[PDB]
Amino acid sequence: QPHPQPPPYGHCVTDSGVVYSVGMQWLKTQGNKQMLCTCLGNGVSCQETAVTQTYGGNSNGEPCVLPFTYNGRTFYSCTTEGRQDGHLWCSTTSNYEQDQKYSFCTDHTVLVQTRGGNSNGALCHFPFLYNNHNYTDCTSEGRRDNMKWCGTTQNYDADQKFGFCPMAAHEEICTTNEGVMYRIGDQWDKQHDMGHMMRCTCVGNGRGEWTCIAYSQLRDQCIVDDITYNVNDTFHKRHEEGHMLNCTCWKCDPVDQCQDSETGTFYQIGDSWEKYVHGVRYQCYCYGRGIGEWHCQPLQT
Amino acid sequence: QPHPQPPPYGHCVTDSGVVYSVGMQWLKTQGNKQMLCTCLGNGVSCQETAVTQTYGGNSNGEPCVLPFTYNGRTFYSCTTEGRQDGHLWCSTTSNYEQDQKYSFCTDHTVLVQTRGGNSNGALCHFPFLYNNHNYTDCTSEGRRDNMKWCGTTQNYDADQKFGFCPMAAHEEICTTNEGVMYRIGDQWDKQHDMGHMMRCTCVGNGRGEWTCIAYSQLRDQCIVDDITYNVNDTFHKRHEEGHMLNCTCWKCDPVDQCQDSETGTFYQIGDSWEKYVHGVRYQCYCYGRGIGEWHCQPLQT
Ligand SMILES: *[C@@H]1O[C@H](CO)[C@@H](O)[C@H](O)[C@H]1NC(C)=O
Ligand SMILES: *[C@@H]1O[C@H](CO)[C@@H](O)[C@H](O)[C@H]1NC(C)=O
Ligand SMILES: *[C@@H]1O[C@H](CO)[C@@H](O)[C@H](O)[C@H]1NC(C)=O
Ligand SMILES: *[C@@H]1O[C@H](CO)[C@@H](O)[C@H](O)[C@H]1NC(C)=O
Ligand SMILES: *[C@@H]1O[C@H](CO)[C@@H](O)[C@H](O)[C@H]1NC(C)=O
Ligand SMILES: *[C@@H]1O[C@H](CO)[C@@H](O)[C@H](O)[C@H]1NC(C)=O
Ligand SMILES: [Zn+2]
Ligand SMILES: [Zn+2]
Ligand SMILES: [Zn+2]
Ligand SMILES: [Zn+2]
Ligand SMILES: [Zn+2]
Ligand SMILES: [Zn+2]
Ligand SMILES: [Zn+2]
Ligand SMILES: [Zn+2]
Ligand SMILES: [Zn+2]
Ligand SMILES: [Zn+2]
Ligand SMILES: [Zn+2]
Ligand SMILES: [Zn+2]
Ligand SMILES: [Zn+2]
Ligand SMILES: [Zn+2]
């Protein structure tokens, strides 16, 4: 394979045969595990994927470790999970339950892996210097076709190293507990309902999640219940989340108890329970949060 | 300007001189106003920007009108605003307060305006037919460089019309009430604090929003208050949102009242108020939602 044109002076020849220039960063991904690699003067340095441009939190605005674990799950991006305030947060270590350290995220708390260009899929380097101005995100500037690119080193004017910034990706398939594969936007009727039928949609939410909705009516009050799932794959474990809304018809009355959708049983806030559904043991919990919010995860060994 | 190679048979020569093929769609944007244009056999047809791949809501899963108005503001994407359940929703008409019709969004409730390629910035056409398979999102397939593209017509195998899908954009600047411009990630200390000092960050949230945080400690309890702002521009009006958290040290006790950050006054749920700050009249409201949530908008004429 040929080698880049200097500057920068110095190259890294990686295990796969790919040649990166000094100052470049790229992602080494093994199954679901991710490493952030750097081409230093003496060779390749790999470490925990750190994502910057954070603020607040108990960690003095330290960078994210992406992915991170929290509440038995893995998060590949910042989340609002666990928060009533809607703020996107991330763990500053790989294990949140252990270390308990976090920061809040901004529109720049992401790593952009480039395509095409000079850089062999290297990450964007921010800030990159172009026309004597520092760009902290991808630009259309200097291009007739208006395509969004970035420098893959600190100085593009000098190094001429770049790549194109693609649209962010998400999983395209929702796989049902019955093994049925659907695409984002597909609709079907729920396979295992509590007499009260449900309408399903493959929503995605970057994890191939599907949501099932059931509408109840007494002409005075309208009870709306929804359950969201995802099946396990290489990146994600199974998860289940149910809500219940009690609206006058709308005007919402808080729902402070949970109803498991596959049993029909009523649980109170702070209650845990187990269920065997479709040949798998689940552990459940009732949060409430005025929306009858309950979660389930498969029983772990 | 030259004309495309058929198929498709037939072309549209637009006001700007741009030539689109029959079956193509593009966005005509006038200031903050947006139109969705189609190249039909007889010419150009424009209408309200409709975004599909929705589900649920009181409208039978009708498409989004993007942008839409809700609660005195304009939304260019789906929002969770107003919802305690975190579900992304959109209005099915341009005015929500009037028509009250909505759908819920999926990972496909977006319109992707292409760059480069054959198509002059045309929107992605989903599904597009490639290698006798229908693609409902951008692909890496058929490309060595792994760049993400889409067909800009129903049949790419036949029409050969495509464009590249760029990374989604957001506003890069947070402009302060004092007129100070910051970039996403910049930090500063708040200009007008209630004795209790605040640390600011230019967060973005696709609207150049900046959040100010103040930490209070009694060693037993930790009160955390945050205020989020954006100044007016061509796309967005001014908005202000404050929260207050009361955590033991964490374990949260719900905060069911509001404290205006620029006055220090305590308001209860369902209370409205006015304030004159930095030479502008504001109308305010106390929602609570266990997080002392209050919003302000400038007084309208
Ligand atoms: C550009 O950024 C680098 C550090 O990111 C800084 O050292 C340099 O002073 C900046 N210069 C310009 C031209 O903005
Ligand atoms: C998915 O989960 C089932 C356990 O219910 C397990 O047997 C299977 O090996 C898992 N496979 C994948 C693709 O993770
Ligand atoms: C909804 O409200 C009615 C009274 O307002 C109450 O009886 C009912 O329990 C609430 N929800 C359910 C699950 O019935
Ligand atoms: C592809 O999609 C079009 C409608 O979107 C449909 O009419 C056609 O049958 C589909 N065919 C294939 C090959 O998937
Ligand atoms: C922004 O708001 C101020 C009113 O406070 C108004 O005078 C000014 O014209 C507005 N300008 C823009 C750029 O929208
Ligand atoms: C936080 O909790 C303490 C008692 O637990 C309460 O006195 C205090 O009012 C709460 N918040 C504030 C704003 O003081
Ligand atoms: Zn070399
Ligand atoms: Zn909010
Ligand atoms: Zn940006
Ligand atoms: Zn079954
Ligand atoms: Zn998955
Ligand atoms: Zn819900
Ligand atoms: Zn959960
Ligand atoms: Zn022609
Ligand atoms: Zn939730
Ligand atoms: Zn997709
Ligand atoms: Zn001032
Ligand atoms: Zn704006
Ligand atoms: Zn907050
Ligand atoms: Zn508001």
Say which experimental method was used: X-ray
CB-based burial of residue B83 (10 Å sphere; 0-12 exposed, 13-18 middle, 19+ buried)? middle
Residue of B nearest to A187 (CA): B55
- Counting ligand 6 atoms within 8 A of each CB, the residue from B219, B246, B294 with the most, and so the one to mutate, is B246
Cα A3–chain centre separation? 35
Same fold, A49-106 and A112-165: yes
Relative to beta strand A293-298, strand A281-288 is antiparallel
What the block records as the tokens of A118 is: 């000079």
The string over A82-109, giving b where at least 16 C-beta atoms fall within 10 Å of a residue's C-beta and e elsewhere, is eebbebbbbbbbeebeeeebbbbbbbbb
CA A53 / ligand 19 centre spacing (Å):
18
A119: left (phi over 0), alpha (psi -120 to 50) or beta: alpha
CA distance A256 to B254: 14
What the block records as the tokens of B212 is: 């100010």
Cα-based distances in Å from A142 to A12, A147, A150, A276: 29, 10, 11, 59
Q: For atom 2 of ligand 5, which residue has the closest CA?
A: B232
Mark the breaks in chain A: residue after which each occurs, C to N over 2.5 Å: 249
Measured between CA atoms, how close is A79 to chain B, in angstroms? 11
CB atoms within 10 A of CB B186: 18
Residues A85, B243: C-beta atoms closer than 8 Å: yes
Phi, psi angle pair for A101, to nearest 5° = -105, 135
Q: Which of B228, B234, B244, B243 is nearest to B176 (CA)?
A: B228
Q: For atom 7 of ligand 5, which residue has the closest CA?
A: B232
Chain B residues whose CB is inside 8 A of the A101 CB are none
What the block records as the tokens of B191 is: 């200009």
CB atoms within 10 A of CB B210: 28
Instruction: Please report the DSSP string for chain B in residue order.
Output: ---PPSSSP-EEE-TTS-EEETT-EEEEEETTEEEEEEEETTEEEEEE-EE--EE-TTTTSPPEESSEEETTEEESS-B-TT-SS---EEESSSBHHHH--EEEE-TT-S--B-BSTTTTTPBP-SSEEETTEEESS-B-TT-SS---EEESSSBHHHH--EEE-BPP----EEE-TT--EEETT-EEE-SS-BSB--EEEEEETTTTEEEEEEEEE-SSEEEEEEEEEE---SS---EEEEEEEEEE--EEEPB-EEE-TTT--EEETT-EEEEE-SS-EEEEEEEETTBTEEEEEEPP-
Say if ligand 3 is within 6 A of residue A246 CB: yes
Chain B interface mutation, best of A107, A205, A226, A293, highest count of B Cβ atoms under 10 Å: A107
Measured between CA atoms, how close is B43 to chain A, in angstroms? 25
Q: Which of A19, A18, A27, A25 is nearest to A39 (CA)?
A: A25
Say if ligand 1 is within 6 A of residue A127 CB: yes
Cα B261–chain centre separation? 26
Ligand 16 ion: nearby residues, β-carbon < 5 Å: B 137
For residue B79, give the ligand nearest its CA: 8
CA distance B236 to B170: 12
Q: Which of A32, A39, A24, A47 is nearest to A93 (CA)?
A: A47
Measured between CA atoms, how close is B298 to chain A, in angstroms? 23
Nearest to B184 among A107, A169, A204 (CB): A107
Residue A200 and residue A185 in contact, taking contact as beta carbons nearer than 8 Å: no
CATH number of A112-165: 2.10.10.10
Ligand 13 ion: nearby residues, β-carbon < 5 Å: A 295
Residue B34 and residue B67 in contact, taking contact as beta carbons nearer than 8 Å: yes
Phi, psi angle pair for B144, to nearest 5° = -75, -45
Cα-based distances in Å from A141 to A110, A146, A167, B116: 21, 7, 18, 14
Say if ligand 3 is within 6 A of residue A250 CB: no
Among the listed residues B171, B240, B241, B262, the single catalytic one is B171
Relative to beta strand A68-70, strand A209-217 is unpaired
Measured between CA atoms, how close is A88 to chain B, in angstroms? 10
First to last CA, chain B: 46
- Rg of chain B over all Cα atoms, to the nearest angstrom: 24
| Domain B49-106 falls under CATH 2.60.120.10 | no
Question: Domain extents for chain A?
Answer: 10-48, 49-106, 112-165, 172-299
Q: Which atom of ligand 4 is closest in space to residue B127's alpha carbon?
A: 5
CA distance B85 to A291: 7
The string over A252-273, giving b where at least 16 C-beta atoms fall within 10 Å of a residue's C-beta and e elsewhere, is eeebeebbbbbeeeebeeeeeb
- The β-bridge partners of A77 are none
Chain B interface mutation, best of A83, A106, A135, highest count of B Cβ atoms under 10 Å: A106
Residue A54 and residue A90 in contact, taking contact as beta carbons nearer than 8 Å: yes
CA distance B293 to A85: 9
Three-class DSSP labels, chain A:
CCCCCCCCCCEEECCCCCEEECCCEEEEEECCEEEEEEEECCEEEEEECEECCEECCCCCCCCEECCEEECCEEECCCECCCCCCCCCEEECCCEHHHHCCEEEECCCCCCCECECCCCCCCECCCCEEECCEEECCCECCCCCCCCCEEECCCEHHHHCCEEECECCCCCCEEECCCCCEEECCCEEECCCCECECCEEEEEECCCCEEEEEEEEECCCEEEEEEEEEECCCCCCCCEEEEEEEEEECCEEECECEEECCCCCCEEECCCEEEEECCCCEEEEEEEECCECEEEEEECCC
Contacts with A195 (C-beta within 8 Å, 6 or more apart), sequence order = none
Q: Which amino acid would we find at residue A101?
A: K
Residue A261 and residue A284 in contact, taking contact as beta carbons nearer than 8 Å: no
Topology annotation, domain B10-48:
Complement Module; domain 1 (2.10.70)
Nearest to A165 among B106, B140, B167 (CB): B167
A81 catalytic? Reply is no
Q: Residue for token digits 């149910």?
A: A242
Among the listed residues A171, A172, A262, A293, the single catalytic one is A171
Q: Which of B114, B116, B92, B87 is nearest to B102 (CA)?
A: B92
Q: Which of A167, A150, A168 is nearest to A159 (CA)?
A: A150
Residues B85, A243: C-beta atoms closer than 8 Å: yes
Q: Which of A117, A133, A137 is nearest to A125 (CA)?
A: A137
Residues B108, A185: C-beta atoms closer than 8 Å: yes
Q: Which atom of ligand 6 is closest in space to residue B244's alpha carbon?
A: 13
Q: Residue for token digits 């509001």?
A: B258
Nearest to B147 among A52, A116, A204 (CB): A116
Resolution in A: 2.5
CA B125 / ligand 4 centre spacing (Å):
13
Chain B interface mutation, best of A1, A203, A212, A243, highest count of B Cβ atoms under 10 Å: A203
CA distance B290 to A263: 30
